[PDB]
Amino acid sequence: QAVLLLFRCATGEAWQEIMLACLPGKLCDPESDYNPGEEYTCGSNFAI
Amino acid sequence: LELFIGKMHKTCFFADSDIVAEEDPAPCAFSGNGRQCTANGTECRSGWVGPNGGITNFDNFAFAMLTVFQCITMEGWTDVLYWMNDAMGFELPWVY
Amino acid sequence: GKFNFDETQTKRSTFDNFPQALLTVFQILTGEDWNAVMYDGIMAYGGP
Amino acid sequence: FPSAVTIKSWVDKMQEDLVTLAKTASGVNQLVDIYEKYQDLYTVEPNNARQLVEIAARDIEKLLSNRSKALVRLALEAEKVQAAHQWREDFASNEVVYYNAKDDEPGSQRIKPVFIEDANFGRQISYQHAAVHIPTDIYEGSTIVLNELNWTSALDEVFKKNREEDPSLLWQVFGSATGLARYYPASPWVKIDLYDVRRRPWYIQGAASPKDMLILVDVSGSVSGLTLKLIRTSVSEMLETLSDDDFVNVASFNSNAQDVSCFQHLVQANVRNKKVLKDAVNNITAKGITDYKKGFSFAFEQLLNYNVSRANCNKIIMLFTDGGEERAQEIFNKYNKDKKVRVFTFSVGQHNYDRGPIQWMACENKGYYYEIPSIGAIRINTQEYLDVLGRPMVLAGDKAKQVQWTNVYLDALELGLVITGTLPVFNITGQFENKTNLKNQLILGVMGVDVSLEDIKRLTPRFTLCPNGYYFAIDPNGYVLLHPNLQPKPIGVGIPTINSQEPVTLDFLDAELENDIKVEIRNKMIDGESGEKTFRTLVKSQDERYIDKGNRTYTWTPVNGTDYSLALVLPTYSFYYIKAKLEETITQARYSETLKPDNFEESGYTFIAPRDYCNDLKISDNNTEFLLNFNEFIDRKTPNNPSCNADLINRVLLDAGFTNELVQNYWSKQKNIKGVKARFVVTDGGITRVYPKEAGENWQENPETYEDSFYKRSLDNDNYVFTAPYFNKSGPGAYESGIMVSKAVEIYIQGKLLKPAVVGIKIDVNSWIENFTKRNSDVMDCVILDDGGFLLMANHDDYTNQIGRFFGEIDPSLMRHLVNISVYAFNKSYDYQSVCEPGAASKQSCITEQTQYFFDNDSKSFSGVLDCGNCSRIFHGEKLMNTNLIFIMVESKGTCPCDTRLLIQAEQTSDGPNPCDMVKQPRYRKGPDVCFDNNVLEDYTDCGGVSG
Ligand SMILES: *[C@@H]1O[C@H](CO)[C@@H](O[C@@H]2O[C@H](CO)[C@@H](O[C@@H]3O[C@H](CO)[C@@H](O[C@@H]4O[C@H](CO)[C@@H](O)[C@H](O)[C@H]4NC(C)=O)[C@H](O)[C@H]3NC(C)=O)[C@H](O)[C@H]2NC(C)=O)[C@H](O)[C@H]1NC(C)=O
Ligand SMILES: *[C@@H]1O[C@H](CO)[C@@H](O[C@@H]2O[C@H](CO)[C@@H](O[C@@H]3O[C@H](CO)[C@@H](O)[C@H](O)[C@H]3NC(C)=O)[C@H](O)[C@H]2NC(C)=O)[C@H](O)[C@H]1NC(C)=O
Ligand SMILES: *[C@@H]1O[C@H](CO)[C@@H](O[C@@H]2O[C@H](CO)[C@@H](O)[C@H](O)[C@H]2NC(C)=O)[C@H](O)[C@H]1NC(C)=O
Ligand SMILES: *[C@@H]1O[C@H](CO)[C@@H](O[C@@H]2O[C@H](CO)[C@@H](O)[C@H](O)[C@H]2NC(C)=O)[C@H](O)[C@H]1NC(C)=O
Ligand SMILES: *[C@@H]1O[C@H](CO)[C@@H](O[C@@H]2O[C@H](CO)[C@@H](O)[C@H](O)[C@H]2NC(C)=O)[C@H](O)[C@H]1NC(C)=O
Ligand SMILES: *[C@@H]1O[C@H](CO)[C@@H](O[C@@H]2O[C@H](CO)[C@@H](O)[C@H](O)[C@H]2NC(C)=O)[C@H](O)[C@H]1NC(C)=O
Ligand SMILES: *[C@@H]1O[C@H](CO)[C@@H](O)[C@H](O)[C@H]1NC(C)=O
Ligand SMILES: [Ca+2]
Ligand SMILES: [Ca+2]
């Protein structure tokens, strides 16, 4: 799935829209192990 | 045409109604393989015009001609791919 | 003037006048969202 | 086929087989003996139809004079308090404190109240402060809203002061032009909230004077698409700001100007006419070129008609377009050079056309300019035209401070049917020296105080009148402020076909059966002249199944306080009434003992009418516990009745002794009768009794005597009345109840006729069959119908199974012939307040057509032959004496193989009457005589675009 996403960006489909979706203020799926009391933490400023 | 024809025709309406549940509908599974709308008040069956109002589908040679030429210019080709991961599984469409 | 079939939104890439039709042709020339304009042209003449 | 002579004798035999049983078992003449032989426990008092209406009108006028003083005391203080406001722009330090409705802040602090429950208020209220409602689309905490919450905080003291003088005061509300509404007492607000005080009918009438609108819709090609959907929604939203006093018409133009509907001129803009316009506006298509000259000539010609009834007030044109380059200066110069007509222009949609000419038309003709780019702008921009129309109203001064009253509408806070007083509030800051005068030509807001229709009904008592007598009040428009047939439901229009903000405006001619003599009575009431008239009507029964004719007398006078007119309907035999006169102890205590449920074994199952004797005894609307509450109240209280009237209590107590003297001395002697299943007496006092206590379980009648359909039918008729049981197994009524027969008792005291009670029996259906036969014949049919064509007896054991059914639903060929040969007449009516089942294109409200049948001719012997086609059936109908029954004998329907369409007499959903031809000859009405427009001191220099 990650490789297909990069192939999507290689052709330039909505690569700027994907980048905006990876900024820090994003929800994390419950399957991940994260400390309680913080939900919108995953995502990094390195997405730019 | 051979791998798939008329598959993108099952979107999820509301129960006992003819109103599409979501504002930007996407197909369900053809036969229990792709995507199912899990919303409680909705169920999906046949009777949908299509993803782009009927323009984007593979149910005719003229339509198949137009959809493929759209994907060969790399403009809106993931939308056709993503509508297939809903209509059928994730295994077949990505190769095509 | 044939892009007024939606009755729920205002299309911005139209051919209403020469300055706007000149921008739409330029946008199709770059290839960005050229299919979205094509769908409007098809739906303006009856549909699929 | 038996001869006429021999069949006459057969039906003649059944006449005294039924009448004698009902004359003896019920005891019609015995109750008359009881009433006449005393003549000392009661007195016959005159019931003057002129003095009653005079008294009631003055009480109603005084009620609306209580409220007019409250409105003046509130509007006067609001102007003074607002004039001393400083308009600061920082409330973070000096925070405002108030209670906001619909709650569980830069410069606002909230209040948590106590909300104790109270009577005459179906909610929880608090008298300690006032509640403030702010619409969702309006952000509280802005400079405009916060500045409004200061000078409106001084209204609470006046709110409390008004309630102290008049405790029986309902909602008193201030509707601001900023949007917020502050009402007293505080109460939480009642899906999402869409209430706006500025769009309410009571706010709109006080914001301006009536108007003659003419909406021009641009339907040229360029408006096709989104900007046409916006226009259609904008026109429908502006029609909601109109009432029965405004006249409107909608026209469209695209190279040709034409009407969008069937009206062709200005119409009254009531709930039905506006539905026609709204339907037509939602069906217009965009095509062609734009022609403002032809569109404005058509609009200006329709405002000069003067064949038709108009408002003779503000004449305005609302142009709904997008843009263009035509100014049509020649048309404006020709048609209004003296600026007698305002022009309001709207630029609707997302476009980049030229708005210059559109703005020029706005203030060249004393209008204002609006922009509606999206759906969110429709709600507010279509109500801002009332700011311009109120400019001459504020320049008039104190002569424009007149209290007006709305139509009947359902209160927003779930209080019932109410009317509202109205008074505008002016901005008089700097008016002492007259130095600003720029923002002072707009109203601050509209005052309001609510009056319940139940308050009006308390001033017109009806328990001294016959159950057939009633009051009713009228409006200059013809609508009824007061009527027995007015119900707390919205009035429906058309057919509801889907895959309560309107007023309940019921016309007088639609409240009851319309007649050529009521129309002249209605017109005489509308223009306010007192009079009286005695004449023969035909009256629809309480249950819409029967129609009977009787003498009626209408006495009306105008109420000088307002524009209302009050009338009292009083039949004959009711100009006198029985007034109980007894103050002795033991003669009243014994009568009270007859109400005890444990005494029902010998005194019969006794009911009692849930009447408001006085406050500490509250009605229960079931009579299972009200009787226990009532009889344990009188004994556990001083008999002198210190706090409430004995007239309503002495009457019911007096009739307890009278009915008991009939049940004990006469009904107890004959414990059982073969042809009798029950024995009932219903009295004017409000008590009904059934001698077999086990037969009291089958009683389906209303415990309130005045609401009993069979009681009212018996008084009008001079003979026995047969009541048909309901069909469709609506409870147990087929065989275990019986057939109701009743007859009113008539007594003479000093030569004055009185009808205090009705008596009757429930004849057993099974016993009637045995006498009727002395059966299931395949050749001859024998059925008995009552006045109304309802089956009561039969000769097949199959028709009897479907008892109490309209004879047109079981034998359409014979029933239809009886109408044509003038045996049964029928009047058709429309019911505008009824539950209605939706149809394909819960329940909604629509119009249902009601039809009732009654005896046309006075002849009794009927005979003839029915020609259904290639066959022949001969009949003979004879009517029984001293009753409303008819006996008809026909051959079996199987002989002639014809079964035509069945004749239906039931609640039929309809959409009539047609309003296209109603407006050609509209009912007479009188409009307001005060008109505030065309003031020379008006500024109108801010066209619509000073800020853009
Ligand atoms: C009854 O009528 C009186 C006048 O007859 C009226 O009182 C006047 O109220 C206005 C505000 O509604 C005051 O206006 C002051 O001056 C300007 C006008 O807006 C404001 O400055 C900015 O102006 C821009 C204009 O584009 C505006 O967008 C902005 O919001 C304003 N404020 C800013 C930038 O902070 C002043 O702030 C405003 N207030 C002052 C100076 O305190 C008049 O001064 C008032 N005149 C008098 C004589 O009192 C009163 O509101 C009317 N009653 C009602 C209920 O409306
Ligand atoms: C809009 O808000 C204003 C600010 O809160 C209110 O004005 C303030 O009201 C206070 C209560 O009456 C005043 O306090 C006292 O006022 C008396 C009367 O003149 C004086 O003794 C003093 O000013 C003061 N007493 C003290 C401090 O011991 C405030 O003076 C007054 N003004 C301010 C705070 O600037 C308005 O009342 C309110 N609008 C309305 C209509 O009430
Ligand atoms: C949506 O999912 C289910 C319904 O499909 C809800 O869970 C319960 O499902 C049963 C089975 O039909 C219902 O009878 C219950 O009423 C449902 N709710 C309960 C038990 O609280 C689930 O709650 C729904 N999610 C919502 C409404 O947010
Ligand atoms: C409304 O006002 C009128 C007149 O102002 C009242 O008419 C009075 O009628 C009585 C007899 O019906 C006359 O004796 C009086 O002379 C009349 N009044 C005057 C001023 O001449 C009428 O009574 C008033 N309505 C009510 C309900 O009181
Ligand atoms: C009603 O309005 C019309 C114009 O809208 C007036 O014009 C008259 O129309 C009638 C019918 O043809 C005729 O009398 C004449 O043709 C018109 N002129 C006159 C002087 O009558 C009409 O006068 C208005 N009033 C009435 C009562 O019809
Ligand atoms: C209600 O009563 C009867 C229903 O049958 C009708 O009145 C009669 O109408 C016929 C036909 O026009 C006339 O010949 C009779 O003279 C009428 N009876 C009268 C005037 O007593 C009609 O449907 C209604 N009557 C009204 C509206 O007056
Ligand atoms: C209110 O109206 C009544 C009549 O209904 C009258 O008697 C009274 O004086 C009026 N005023 C007050 C304060 O009650
Ligand atoms: Ca692209
Ligand atoms: Ca145009």
Swiss-Prot record, chain B:
It comes from the Eukaryota. This is Voltage-dependent L-type calcium channel subunit alpha-1D. It is found in: Membrane. Expressed in pancreatic islets and in brain, where it has been seen in cerebral cortex, hippocampus, basal ganglia, habenula and thalamus. Expressed in the small cell lung carcinoma cell line SCC-9. No expression in skeletal muscle. Belongs to the calcium channel alpha-1 subunit (TC 1.A.1.11) family. CACNA1D subfamily. It is linked to Sinoatrial node dysfunction and deafness: A disease characterized by congenital severe to profound deafness without vestibular dysfunction, associated with episodic syncope due to intermittent pronounced bradycardia. Residues 5-92 are extracellular. Voltage-dependent calcium channels are multisubunit complexes, consisting of alpha-1, alpha-2, beta and delta subunits in a 1:1:1:1 ratio. The channel activity is directed by the pore-forming and voltage-sensitive alpha-1 subunit. In many cases, this subunit is sufficient to generate voltage-sensitive calcium channel activity. The auxiliary subunits beta and alpha-2/delta linked by a disulfide bridge regulate the channel activity. Channel activity is further modulated, depending on the presence of specific delta subunit isoforms. Voltage-sensitive calcium channels (VSCC) mediate the entry of calcium ions into excitable cells and are also involved in a variety of calcium-dependent processes, including muscle contraction, hormone or neurotransmitter release, gene expression, cell motility, cell division and cell death. The isoform alpha-1D gives rise to L-type calcium currents. Long-lasting (L-type) calcium channels belong to the 'high-voltage activated' (HVA) group. They are blocked by dihydropyridines (DHP), phenylalkylamines, and by benzothiazepines. Ca(2+) binds at residue 75. Each of the four internal repeats contains five hydrophobic transmembrane segments (S1, S2, S3, S5, S6) and one positively charged transmembrane segment (S4). S4 segments probably represent the voltage-sensor and are characterized by a series of positively charged amino acids at every third position. Glycans are attached at residue 40. Signal peptide: none annotated. The chain holds residues 290 to 385 of 2161 of the full protein.
UniProtKB/Swiss-Prot annotation, chain D:
One of its GO terms (cellular component) is voltage-gated calcium channel complex. Glycans are attached at residues 66, 150, 283, 307, 427, 434, 551, 560, 622, 728, 771, 820, 827, 857, 870. Disulfide bonds join 363-931. Residues 212-389 form the VWFA domain. Pfam families: VGCC_alpha2, VWA, VWA_N. It is a single-pass type I membrane protein. A motif (MIDAS-like motif) lies at residues 218-222. Keywords: Calcium, Calcium channel, Calcium transport, Cell membrane, Disease variant, Disulfide bond, Epilepsy, Glycoprotein, Intellectual disability, Ion channel, Ion transport, Membrane, Metal-binding, Phosphoprotein, Signal, Transmembrane, Transmembrane helix, Transport, Voltage-gated channel. Isoform 1 is expressed in skeletal muscle. Isoform 2 is expressed in the central nervous system. Isoform 2, isoform 4 and isoform 5 are expressed in neuroblastoma cells. Isoform 3, isoform 4 and isoform 5 are expressed in the aorta. Proteolytically processed into subunits alpha-2-1 and delta-1 that are disulfide-linked. GO terms for molecular function: metal ion binding; voltage-gated calcium channel activity. Its main location: membrane. Residues 405-503 form the Cache domain. The alpha-2/delta subunit of voltage-dependent calcium channels regulates calcium current density and activation/inactivation kinetics of the calcium channel. Plays an important role in excitation-contraction coupling. Binds gabapentin, an antiepileptic drug. It is linked to Developmental and epileptic encephalopathy 110: A form of epileptic encephalopathy, a heterogeneous group of early-onset epilepsies characterized by refractory seizures, neurodevelopmental impairment, and poor prognosis. Development is normal prior to seizure onset, after which cognitive and motor delays become apparent. DEE110 is an autosomal recessive form characterized by profound global developmental delay and hypotonia apparent in infancy followed by onset of seizures in the first months or years of life. The MIDAS-like motif in the VWFA domain binds divalent metal cations and is required to promote trafficking of the alpha-1 (CACNA1) subunit to the plasma membrane by an integrin-like switch. This is Voltage-dependent calcium channel subunit alpha-2/delta-1. The lineage of its organism: Eukaryota, Metazoa, Chordata, Craniata, Vertebrata.
